[PDB]
Design an enzyme around this catalytic site. Structure first.
Site, mmCIF file in Angstrom:
data_model
loop_
_atom_site.group_PDB
_atom_site.id
_atom_site.type_symbol
_atom_site.label_atom_id
_atom_site.label_comp_id
_atom_site.label_asym_id
_atom_site.label_seq_id
_atom_site.Cartn_x
_atom_site.Cartn_y
_atom_site.Cartn_z
ATOM 1 N N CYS A 80 2.083 12.204 3.096
ATOM 2 C CA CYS A 80 1.684 11.239 2.088
ATOM 3 C C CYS A 80 2.849 11.021 1.136
ATOM 4 C CB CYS A 80 0.461 11.748 1.329
ATOM 5 S SG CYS A 80 0.126 10.869 -0.196
ATOM 6 N N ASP A 125 -2.496 1.343 8.764
ATOM 7 C CA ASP A 125 -1.431 2.326 8.599
ATOM 8 C C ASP A 125 -0.900 2.768 9.961
ATOM 9 O OD1 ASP A 125 0.222 4.427 7.727
ATOM 10 O OD2 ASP A 125 -1.376 5.339 6.512
ATOM 11 N N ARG A 162 7.863 0.220 4.891
ATOM 12 C CA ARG A 162 7.695 1.096 3.742
ATOM 13 C C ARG A 162 8.849 2.084 3.674
ATOM 14 N NH1 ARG A 162 2.787 5.597 2.687
ATOM 15 N NH2 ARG A 162 4.213 7.380 2.428
ATOM 16 N N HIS A 212 3.030 10.818 -1.852
ATOM 17 C CA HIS A 212 2.912 11.549 -3.106
ATOM 18 C C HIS A 212 2.754 13.049 -2.886
ATOM 19 C CE1 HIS A 212 1.637 7.308 -3.998
ATOM 20 N NE2 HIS A 212 2.696 7.484 -4.770
ATOM 21 N N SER A 215 -3.429 8.857 -6.336
ATOM 22 C CA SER A 215 -2.638 10.059 -6.588
ATOM 23 C C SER A 215 -1.996 10.050 -7.972
ATOM 24 C CB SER A 215 -1.542 10.244 -5.528
ATOM 25 O OG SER A 215 -2.067 10.477 -4.221
ATOM 26 N N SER A 273 -2.035 3.784 -6.404
ATOM 27 C CA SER A 273 -2.473 5.028 -5.764
ATOM 28 C C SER A 273 -3.437 5.824 -6.640
ATOM 29 C CB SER A 273 -1.262 5.903 -5.432
ATOM 30 O OG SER A 273 -1.682 7.139 -4.876
ATOM 31 N N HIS A 314 1.765 -1.353 8.748
ATOM 32 C CA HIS A 314 2.915 -0.858 7.999
ATOM 33 C C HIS A 314 3.492 0.415 8.613
ATOM 34 C CE1 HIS A 314 0.873 2.464 5.734
ATOM 35 N NE2 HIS A 314 -0.107 1.623 5.460
#
Ligand SMILES: O=C(O)[C@H]1O[C@H]1C(=O)O
Ligand SMILES: O=C(O)[C@H]1O[C@H]1C(=O)O
Ligand SMILES: O=C(O)[C@H]1O[C@H]1C(=O)O
Ligand SMILES: O=C(O)[C@H]1O[C@H]1C(=O)O
Ligand SMILES: [Mg+2]
Ligand SMILES: [Mg+2]
Ligand SMILES: [Mg+2]
Ligand SMILES: [Mg+2]
Ligand SMILES: [Mg+2]
Ligand SMILES: [Mg+2]
Ligand SMILES: [Mg+2]
Ligand SMILES: [Mg+2]
Lengths: 427, 427, 427, 427
Positions: free
Chosen positions: A191, A153, A228, A193, A317, A315, A180
């Site tokens: 995040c 990440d 992304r 989400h 989430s 996810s 990414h």
């Protein structure tokens, strides 16, 4: 002086860009001479980053899809590979919560020091290398490739295009295979989400993707670059300067000076098409696990870029069984793969496995002491028929490998570890 | 030009040593003036080290016994306290295997950098502080003390008396409540259940225990000091110079220059008695979980020091059900507590919970993809009845706490995290 | 369940804000209850941060002015205090160039990991503490305060208000006395004497200063907060949203979306007045060392806030003799102090001392080998006449202090350091 | 499934050991197969360690001698190379005093974390790489090799043979060219010119040197291995087990169990001869800078090993002018070189240049403020005749290099740094 590490000529680099299928439909807005000018007189070889990126790229074309789980410790990645997985996902969320260089617990808002994810890349590679070393001296051929590729990440790059550059370079030094990069404002990163997301202009994220490719070229490795977009949920953007973003801009502002913008799959499709010449895979964050919405994104992008591979966040989430029945859950990744989502990953798997397993054990221990631990040890013995090995914890962390170093240095040493251990006697 | 941090006078320190019951039967072979001479002009307060050591000492007298599990990440310690535990154990073994500052996986041989355990102490305290911060803004009173005392592994001191001193100082700066020190040669240190152990002379370990107490005195905190002996299994010792060790010396020497020595419970009892004036708790490593052997050790030490508290390693290096039946396992810790083992701990609980849980998840994921993860998420949901909170992972790592900071700075912020999140929408 | 570290009540905090002269004309836009709500159940004491901030505040009122030099190593700070300086300046520029946690050499553009300056604050405090410890056992009273206050660089906060909060908290944990914060866009941060600077809106910097004050209140220390403006040279700003910035907006735009703005002393005076309620000192970066320009800035700010103290960068980025004659250079700091510039500092003094002194030594060594080093050694001997002590390098780094620790643990030790050393025999 | 990093076969390694002149008269007591068994399935390339070790070995044979100065920061090493030096010396003493990962100031007693020297190795290489990158874009051809070989301090291994192994591996990973290892007891390690030194048996140090060679072989780099003996001044040894040490034992033992031993040049010659098959260079610590004592040592070693190269510490722990006249000081290194001392170094040059230069500046600043700094700046301008470049501090740390990255990513960037800088305007 030496020819060790002599850089390639600009002509050699250009010939590679022109002929190697790896670079089919990869746009570079800078030149081969630009790259050589930045390399100094010696180029360090990055063995694990080169191998990992090559293995990852081949796997993305040979396997039906490549899937992964988030890992925040080295031992976690070792078990993922021992259980059969062929890639490791390095979650920034997990690093913020439990594995970053500040020592603090953070929510997922780019709060931790920017060299934290590279340090965890290096740790995972170190752990996999030790498992590989142990397997070799043990004659264990059960795992074909201990050095699974790491996809890590890069968040929003922790600043400008130069911060992006430096993060990509550090990830490569640590041995990453892919990274990414998301189109959010670093100073307000979230995040995918969480609420309160702020986008940056389309061209600013192309600059980020260009800088991440540039750092990989200067480091002479074919790193997999993933773009992304957070435009499905974000309702703010920093500026209206980019004509590709203006169709979604409402004209409202905020006190901070942000522009309100209309979210959903449409700006996601638009941004993905803009990013596609600059990304090996494209990833759209979504609010629910929805195969039909994933299809609409896939088909719209491939209408213009038929060969563009995509990635999908499975996810934690999401509350999965509030959204989907068991049969759709069981087919979820297979159906995504048929739509061209070739890299799929459960971001927070490590956080949830670690937090749940310790709560479960500690709660039983608080109530019944040793009986609760013995229940875990017995599940471990039972898992050996599935290939689990860490029941024998001494050999698992290398006691036998360092015994071999010790007797190589001094075959008569009186102080080796495994002979006379309770592991030898009771396991 | 300040009185902040002014040191105490030697007379005040001496008066405390003479009258505070905390120091009954504690021998200090140095003086109160010696302590002041080393304190400079300003003494930093170590709040968490002071509070932790005070809470630990009181719990050791108020509770039937204090037990703990090994923790190698901050989230791990948070779940242990959430589940009802009142102390944290910080294993050097686990730090070697999966959490040390070299980034490598090591067996338990003092191979990692000597500030690694202090860094994990600081991390655990940070993670407990965040849990405490979150609970306060949520009005959650279910945990009475989030800042559970940490007992940490000082191994063999990583060298001489000065290396011991600096490690104790660093553990205190990080907020440790207690630390343990073993009578092994640091250059050949082993896990107590590995072979190849070399003891140091009895008086050398008294020097180590004195150095650990001195560092705590200079730091002005009442750290709990734990002495560990490895003489049950060790068959080597560096020297025969100490008359207390000479009964067990056989006269034979190795090519390294070590002396062969007779191991067992007898040298353990002798060393425990010699260490007792210099340690708040005494710990004998053992080769099996054996209540009768523990009683023999306890009764022998208490025959001369009736009030001496003891510690016991309920080690995962034992195959528990190979040695004991289920009824004995269920009563094991309760029986030890009645013998005076007031601190009991499972050293490698974190290693095994982490490695097993990720293997199990990854194996299922390799076979069934999302089906395997949903099984874990559903088990997490079910655990909420027992007090588990980490299913809502955003609040668990402080998303709501940092939202509160953001709205304190700017009540009109457009970029807060929990409003609009999928956690708010689906959990 | 202990009283160590109990937080104050909101009523106590409010009474301090309302009546302590430290907080005269300090605006806090949050409440005392807001602070308590963020403090959890235990507040760690930060001895060195408290003492340093208190000493710095008193010095700024008792001395004609406080001056400092940039320090990037612990030994550097020790020599500054030994030579008679009463504060230490911690330059982020120097940290980027030669002392940051990435290990890389960077220009001054917020490229390094955000915990880098806190780590150097802690190192400097550790080094001063050792000098203090050595002086005490040597009976050396020549330096009245070894723990000189540290003023550290918070740059542009490495992101948003939450990144500011965490940096300030970490600086305090490390023992900082004061910190400074500049009104630049973090993702495009520059040294004030570099080009390409981008301002943020006036209200966004007030948010930064509010967040810095809030972190200090939550940590319960009276940290000195310094506001810096870069508007003398910057011709870009992120947004025209703030009506106080609109008078200087030209209307012209860049491809990135930035706004051109009119630079000079006028927007600096405006921003200084807006920041004054939120800053203990105000600092305007300038393009030349110019006493007339400093007088114009000081008089315009003090026309509204007569008691507002100011800070001035005597920058090595100036070519000093190109601008000023020797008489003006000699009186430069004294004249600034009479205008209210009570904190004055040479930012890059450490970089230039270190780089020049090693080039000079190594150049002479390359030509003449030992003759060049002996010339340095003889200059060091000659400096003992001004109080220099580092010629005796063993005692300088604490050999005698650790000898005292060793003989406190074991007064009969055969392995102490200074006895029999060449320092004892030849110096 | 890649060929990247494929290890060599044992046959290939053996053929290189048997035929490459680099390994003439190098004893390996383990086998080529032993090395392959420890390499796992992938061998990381270590470019800087390979290039540095190769350059060092050729320089030791081509130059009349190789000399170096101790460096503790990256900028220090850059100035040493800019000034014409061909190697960097990385002192453990200096790391203890001012550049180690504990953050504390320490005397030279192996108190700091064992990965501290590797971190400084990586830092120095990073700094030399930046100077190389800058030179390339500036067209600066004045330095032929920016990546000068680094010779680093392994002290006494920080424990046993396995600690030695891990430290050598880490130094190589960081890019070291050579490392030195001394025959002291790690738990009682001293600077060679402090008292209280304890030797280990001759064979124990051969084990150390064998472990250091093994780690280099497993890492597949030809690291230069240096053996140091401390027997000139040490009067203690851990054991009399080794018959080569027994001629110097007296029979007496200290209270800790150490043996007393007769120090001087005779045990140094004995130990050097025993170490010679296991070391590329041999170093004897001495109490004075004495050319006839060096000739006695060199002639005794070379009578048996004619081609054995030696190293010499031109130590600042000597008071040079109370021992030697100016004429002898001037010829010192040239005379040593004729005796076979091919690597010569001033260990503490960096500590003394740093501490003296900051004391001198700060003292003048305390008296005369800006006049004292202007004197330094003018000395820097004057040194540009000799090749000094750091007066232009922005380009010196890479502002021009990162400008080039930024315009490679975005040629129309509004936010590059050097254009509009005071450096471009006043320098
Ligand atoms: O799955 C999640 O919600 C977290 O991984 C973070 C993200 O999606 O940005
Ligand atoms: O329980 C164990 O075996 C590991 O904790 C280590 C020890 O006992 O020394
Ligand atoms: O004095 C300077 O030029 C450097 O310290 C940096 C700044 O001023 O921002
Ligand atoms: O030169 C010195 O005195 C110090 O470098 C240390 C040593 O010699 O071991
Ligand atoms: Mg992320
Ligand atoms: Mg593409
Ligand atoms: Mg242990
Ligand atoms: Mg006792
Ligand atoms: Mg700065
Ligand atoms: Mg004010
Ligand atoms: Mg040394
Ligand atoms: Mg040789």
């Amino acid at each position: 002086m030496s020819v060790v590490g002599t850089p390639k000529s600009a002509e050699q680099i250009q010939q590679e860009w022109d002929t190697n299928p790896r670079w089919k439909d990869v746009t570079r807005t800078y030149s081969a001479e630009d790259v050589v000018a930045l390399q100094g007189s010696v180029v360090e070889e990055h063995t694990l980053a080169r191998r990992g990126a090559e293995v990852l790229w081949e796997q993305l074309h040979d396997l039906e899809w490549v899937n992964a789980l988030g890992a925040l410790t080295g031992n976690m990645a070792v078990q993922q590979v021992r259980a059969g997985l062929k890639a490791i996902y390095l979650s920034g969320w997990q690093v913020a919560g439990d594995a970053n260089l500040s020592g603090h617990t953070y929510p997922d808002q780019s709060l931790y020091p920017a060299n934290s994810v590279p340090q965890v890349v290096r740790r995972i590679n170190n752990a996999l290398q030790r498992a590989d070393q142990i397997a070799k001296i043990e004659g264990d051929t059960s795992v074909e490739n201990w050095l699974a590729p790491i996809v890590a990440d890069g968040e929003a790059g922790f600043g400008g295009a130069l911060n992006v550059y430096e993060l990509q370079k550090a990830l490569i030094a640590a041995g990453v295979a892919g990274s990414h990069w998301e189109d959010q404002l670093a100073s307000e990163k979230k995040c995918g989400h969480l609420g309160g997301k702020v986008l940056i202009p389309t061209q600013q994220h192309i600059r980020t993707l260009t800088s991440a490719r540039l750092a990989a070229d200067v480091a002479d490795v074919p790193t997999v670059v993933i773009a992304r977009t957070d435009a499905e949920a974000a309702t703010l953007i920093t500026s209206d300067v980019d004509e590709r973003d203006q169709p979604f801009i409402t004209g409202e502002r905020t006190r901070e000076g942000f522009y309100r913008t209309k979210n959903g799959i449409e700006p996601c499709i638009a941004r993905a098409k803009a990013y596609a010449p600059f990304a090996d895979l494209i990833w759209m964050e979504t609010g629910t696990p929805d195969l039909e919405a994933a299809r609409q994104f896939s088909e719209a992008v491939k209408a213009e870029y038929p060969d563009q591979m995509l990635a999908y966040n499975c996810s934690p989430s999401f509350n999965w069984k509030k959204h989907l029945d068991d049969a759709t859950i069981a087919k979820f990744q297979k159906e995504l793969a048929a739509m061209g989502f070739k890299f799929q990953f459960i971001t927070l798997a490590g956080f949830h496995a670690l937090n749940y397993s310790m709560f479960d054990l500690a709660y039983g221990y608080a109530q019944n002491q040793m009986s609760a631990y013995v229940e875990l040890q017995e599940r471990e013995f039972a898992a050996e028929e599935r290939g689990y090995t860490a029941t024998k914890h001494q050999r698992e962390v290398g006691a036998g490998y360092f015994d071999r170093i010790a007797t190589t240095v001094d075959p008569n040493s009186s102080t080796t570890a495994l002979t006379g251990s309770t592991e030898e006697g009771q396991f």
